[PDB]
């Protein structure tokens, strides 16, 4: 109940929304259920939780400080605003984002990588990322773990989750609900905070 007492944890969740024209947009889909589930469990563990969310149909848990955004750019600005004052950042979006160049046949431009940015300006914070691949899961998750300067990468297929920690340890899980996975993740984070 007090496992993460006083720990500031920032979580990103949901999809990003990129405009094409005033009445059209594209969506890099991400459910948001996982992020919102982690946020709820984190609160119950006594953590100070900040949730940066894209457009979802979900309602944030009580006591969760939530910022609703749409674009990947706004999500970036929101995370940077809090990054100095947090202990843990959990990026719950395995999808790399793309964005149209104009706001009026559709030219796409590269968006700024959130996890890469946080890794470059990282001080003492812990970076947790996600990954969802159908091939070379271990190789990709490990590559992302080292490239983005992260502490743990959560790999996906109710969920079947394998976690890859920075120290080299690998933890596979059976079929669990999102809330169960959330607990296992926050358990791992709790330990990394003690290692420091």
TrEMBL record:
Residues 4-190 form the DNA/pantothenate metabolism flavoprotein C-terminal domain. CTP binds at residues 97, 130, 144, 148. Residues 9-196 are annotated as: Phosphopantothenate--cysteine ligase. Catalyzes two steps in the biosynthesis of coenzyme A. In the first step cysteine is conjugated to 4'-phosphopantothenate to form 4-phosphopantothenoylcysteine, in the latter compound is decarboxylated to form 4'-phosphopantotheine. In the N-terminal section; belongs to the HFCD (homo-oligomeric flavin containing Cys decarboxylase) superfamily. This is Coenzyme A biosynthesis bifunctional protein CoaBC. The chain holds residues 185 to 399 of 401 of the full protein.
């Amino acid at each position: 109940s007090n496992a993460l007492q006083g720990k500031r944890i920032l979580i990103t969740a949901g999809p990003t929304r990129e405009k094409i024209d005033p009445v059209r947009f594209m969506t890099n889909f991400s459910s948001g259920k996982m992020g919102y589930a982690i946020a709820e469990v984190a609160v119950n563990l006594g953590a100070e939780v900040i949730l940066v969310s894209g457009p979802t149909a979900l309602n944030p848990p009580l006591h969760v400080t939530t910022v609703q955004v749409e674009s990947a750019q706004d999500m970036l600005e929101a995370v940077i605003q809090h990054y100095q004052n947090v202990d843990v950042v959990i990026k719950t979006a395995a999808v790399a984002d793309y964005r149209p160049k104009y706001v009026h046949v559709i030219e796409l431009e590269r968006t700024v990588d959130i996890l890469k940015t946080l890794g470059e300006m990282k001080d003492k914070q812990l970076l947790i990322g996600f990954a969802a691949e159908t091939t070379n899961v271990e190789e990709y998750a490990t590559k992302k773990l080292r490239e983005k300067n992260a502490n743990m990468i959560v790999a996906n297929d109710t969920n079947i989750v394998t976690m890859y920690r920075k120290d080299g340890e690998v933890i596979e899980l059976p079929l669990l609900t999102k809330k169960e996975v959330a607990r296992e993740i926050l358990k791992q984070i709790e330990m990394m905070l003690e290692d420091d």
